[PDB]
Amino acid sequence: SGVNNTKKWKMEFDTRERWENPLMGWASTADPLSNMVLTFSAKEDAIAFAEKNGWSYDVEEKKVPKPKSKSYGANFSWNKRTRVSTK
Amino acid sequence: KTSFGSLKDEDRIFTNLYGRHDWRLKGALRRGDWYKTKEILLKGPDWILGEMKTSGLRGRGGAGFPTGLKWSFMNKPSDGRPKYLVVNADEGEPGTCKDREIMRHDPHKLVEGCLVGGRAMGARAAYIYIRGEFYNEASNLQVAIREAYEAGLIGKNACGSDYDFDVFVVRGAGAYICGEETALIESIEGKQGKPRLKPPFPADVGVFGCPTTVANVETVAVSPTICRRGGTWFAGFGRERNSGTKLFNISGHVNHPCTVEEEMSVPLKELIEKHAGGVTGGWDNLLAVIPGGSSTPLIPKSVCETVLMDFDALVQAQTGLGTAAVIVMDRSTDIVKAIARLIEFYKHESCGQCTPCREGVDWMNKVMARFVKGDARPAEIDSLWEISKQIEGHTICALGDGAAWPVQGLIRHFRPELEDRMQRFAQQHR
Amino acid sequence: GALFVHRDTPENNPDTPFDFTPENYKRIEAIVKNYPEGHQAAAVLPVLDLAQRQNGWLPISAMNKVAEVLQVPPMRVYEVATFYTMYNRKPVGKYHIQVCTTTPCMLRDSDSILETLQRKLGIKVGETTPDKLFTLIEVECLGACVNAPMVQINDNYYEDLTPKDIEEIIDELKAGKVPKPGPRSGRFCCEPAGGLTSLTEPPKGPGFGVQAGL
Ligand SMILES: Cc1cc2nc3c(=O)[nH]c(=O)nc-3n(C[C@H](O)[C@H](O)[C@H](O)COP(=O)(O)O)c2cc1C
Ligand code: SF4
Ligand code: FES
């Protein structure tokens, strides 16, 4: 339920091929940018950083949970379906 | 006046306390019940609530809230929902048996009290929730209710007052927590007796989600007499803000354990000696008293000498009036084992809903069991004190608080007795 | 000891026969009508209690029948049957002896009553006699502490007991007689022994002390 990891903008690269190492079975790669993650304070900072480095980018809008109406008293309604059968 | 006690039989309300007169309607009428009820009803809600406010009556279920203020939360225009009065007859606090006598010997006082109180709140019916173990009392109460229906005193056109009122009896199935006012409402609604959080308050959202007042049997039963004889008469007993008469249960180590009606603010010493026949073996044999039932902390013999039995006086003694159930322990008693068995009760009675009481009370119970043997070290006494303070004030309902206070009463007044057992246990093994 | 999970057995399973007798069905619809329309889950505690008064105890089939009769989910009936301690989810004896051992009773020697019952019946608390006529358990306060020590046997209270008194009550039940509820000490209910200290005067009659203008 913690939300502390949904507060900063992140830049990550497109995932590339990983393959099995014949000796040990380890996951091998040829992608030098496979672990690169950059943190940004604003969407506009991240866009600016990608553009000067010549990287094509896709930007997705931040999703905030919608405000909700919580009423503990609704659990005991006279005539509504919100009445809970158990506690 | 500054001296209280020596109540006269003319001023007693529960005149058939001991079941020596007929408990049916014929006897109840002779004793003055159901007299001028139609007159009281037609004087209206505001007048009735005025009498209860003037009398200074306070809750008899344990918490002692001013009754007239509480009952006035229902004095509001309806919103299309029915209005209800619940009468708490669960009576499950160890040491308390006062409500049991009202229902079996003065059932028509309670039924009339339901109507007068139900009218003042504007309620359509009364649900009396009685503990399941009180089967014979529940059947006495239904016989009285049937008699009142046949005589026109309740039901359609109650007492000829053009006001409709029903009185249903619902029985519990064995749970002390169902005496908590919102756990009782849930149990009526067919659920586990788990208390609700507040808000909402029952006067807003109660049983079936409707405006409700939960009132104690003793609170409800004395209301018709307060209206007939007036709030000034009732306010003439006990200290200010602690007025009226009260039913006391004296049990434990007394010569004559009994139930008796006495004026409020009566000295605790006078109550035990006059009515209960004194402490088993003399006043000097007294060790400690639990003055309000299990939930109230014990006090030692030194405090008991001068303490008055009313709400404010026992608050200054670091305990409380509670249900006015006096439990007496003489010096032959194992004080630690006595309080440990009370923690064992609360552990068996926790509804389990909320973390501090579900886990904490069970934790306190285990530590107390080790304190009885002395299988602990004195550093744990302060640990148990802190654990009880973590439960208190942090739970949904007052059961958690009522479990913490007995521990604190023991630690406050009998720390040397605990540390002495730990010393004996350590040397008995080392 | 007393578990809160059901596991099927031949004697207790969903096919164990249970039904309400026709007389008890008339009693159910009186119970249900005590509540607002559309709030008939309120009838679970009485109806579930009625199934046990007919049957003595509650197999899973009896709980399932209550849920169907009231059209509540069975889990909501199971929750109730496992919460309230008066429902017997295992069979009990003909006489269910319940001895209070809370502190007000313990101070007046409820331990002696429990010891006498164990040795007399030859069982321990929580067990049933081999002939299945008594079950013995300890209970919390029954609201009769001034009349301690006391026991409940089915719907009746037997109070102000001594080891000799409890033996008599056990003999009467083995014989087939009903002992009689109440104190076994000489007093009638909750009065102080040795004479009333209050309410010795006649009641004052109708209209006494009424305020003027009422
Ligand atoms: C665990 C617990 C048990 C209670 N048991 C009872 C009871 O058996 N009878 C009662 O009148 N109040 C009992 N109360 C107090 C009620 O919650 C409530 O305050 C009271 O019944 C109604 O208010 P009144 O006394 O002013 O009339 C209990 C409270 C708690 C926390
Ligand atoms: S304090 Fe105890 S009895 Fe009260 S709601 Fe919490 S767990 Fe239940
Ligand atoms: S302590 Fe036994 S009946 Fe109350």
Curated annotation (Swiss-Prot), chain A:
Compartments annotated for it: namely:
Mitochondrion inner membrane
Gene inactivation effect: Reduces the levels of assembled mitochondrial membrane respiratory chain NADH dehydrogenase (Complex I) and the rate of Complex I-driven oxygen consumption. Growth is retarded although activity and behavior are not affected during the first 4 weeks. With aging, results in increasing lethargy, rapid deterioration of motor ability, weight loss followed by death. Mitochondrial ultrastructure is normal, although large subsarcolemmal clusters of mitochondria are present in the soleus.
Q: Which residues in this protein are found as Phosphoserine?
A: 85
Record's subunit section: This is a component of the iron-sulfur (IP) fragment of the enzyme. Interacts with BCAP31 and TOMM40; the interaction mediates its translocation to the mitochondria; the interaction with BCAP31 is direct.
* Family note: Belongs to the complex I NDUFS4 subunit family.
Q: What biological function has been recorded for the protein in this entry?
A: Accessory subunit of the mitochondrial membrane respiratory chain NADH dehydrogenase (Complex I), that is believed not to be involved in catalysis. Complex I functions in the transfer of electrons from NADH to the respiratory chain. The immediate electron acceptor for the enzyme is believed to be ubiquinone.
This chain's protein is named NADH dehydrogenase [ubiquinone] iron-sulfur protein 4, mitochondrial
The gene behind this protein is Ndufs4
Residue numbers of the full-length protein present here: 89 to 175 of 175
Curated annotation (Swiss-Prot), chain B:
Enumerate the transmembrane spans.
Answer: none
Question: What is the enzyme's class at the highest EC level?
Answer: translocase
CC terms in the record's Gene Ontology section: mitochondrial inner membrane; mitochondrion; respiratory chain complex I
Protein family? Belongs to the complex I 51 kDa subunit family.
List the cofactors. Answer: FMN; [4Fe-4S] cluster
N6-acetyllysine-modified residues are where?
53, 76, 347
Q: For the modification Omega-N-methylarginine, which residues carry it? A: 229
One of the GO biological process terms: proton motive force-driven mitochondrial ATP synthesis
Q: Which residues carry this modification: N6-succinyllysine?
A: 53
Q: What is this protein called?
A: NADH dehydrogenase [ubiquinone] flavoprotein 1, mitochondrial
User: Which residues are NADH-binding?
Assistant: 59-68
Q: Give residues annotated as binding [4Fe-4S] cluster.
A: 351, 354, 357, 397
Key word DNA repair present: no
- SUPFAM superfamilies in UniProt: Nqo1 FMN-binding domain-like, Nqo1 middle domain-like, Nqo1C-terminal domain-like
Its subcellular locations are: Mitochondrion inner membrane
The residues the record assigns to binding FMN are 171-219
Catalysed transformations (reactions):
a ubiquinone + NADH + 5 H(+)(in) = a ubiquinol + NAD(+) + 4 H(+)(out)
Using the UniProt record, give the first listed, main subcellular location. mitochondrion
UniProtKB/Swiss-Prot annotation, chain C:
Residue(s) carrying Phosphotyrosine: 158
Task: Give the EC number(s) under which this enzyme is classified.
Answer: 7.1.1.2
GO terms for biological process, alphabetical = aerobic respiration; cardiac muscle tissue development; mitochondrial electron transport, NADH to ubiquinone; nervous system development; proton motive force-driven mitochondrial ATP synthesis
Has the keyword Signal been applied to this entry? no
Locate the residues binding [2Fe-2S] cluster: 100, 105, 141, 145
* Top-level taxonomic group: Eukaryota
Q: Which cofactor does it need?
A: [2Fe-2S] cluster
Q: Which GO terms describe its molecular function?
A: 2 iron, 2 sulfur cluster binding; metal ion binding; NADH dehydrogenase (ubiquinone) activity
Q: Which residues carry this modification: N6-acetyllysine?
A: 26
Q: What is its main location?
A: mitochondrion
Topology of the protein relative to the lipid bilayer: Peripheral membrane protein
Report the enzyme's class at the first EC level: translocase
Q: Where are the transmembrane segments?
A: none
Q: Does the keyword NAD apply?
A: yes
Q: Describe the subunit structure.
A: Core subunit of respiratory chain NADH dehydrogenase (Complex I) which is composed of 45 different subunits. This is a component of the flavoprotein-sulfur (FP) fragment of the enzyme.
**What family is this?**
Belongs to the complex I 24 kDa subunit family.
Report the NCBIfam families cross-referenced here.
nuoE_fam, PRK07539.1-2, PRK07539.1-5
What does the protein in this record do? Core subunit of the mitochondrial membrane respiratory chain NADH dehydrogenase (Complex I) which catalyzes electron transfer from NADH through the respiratory chain, using ubiquinone as an electron acceptor. Parts of the peripheral arm of the enzyme, where the electrons from NADH are accepted by flavin mononucleotide (FMN) and then passed along a chain of iron-sulfur clusters by electron tunnelling to the final acceptor ubiquinone. Contains one iron-sulfur cluster.
Q: What is this protein called?
A: NADH dehydrogenase [ubiquinone] flavoprotein 2, mitochondrial
Source organism per UniProt: Mus musculus (Mouse)
Encoding gene, per UniProt annotation: Ndufv2
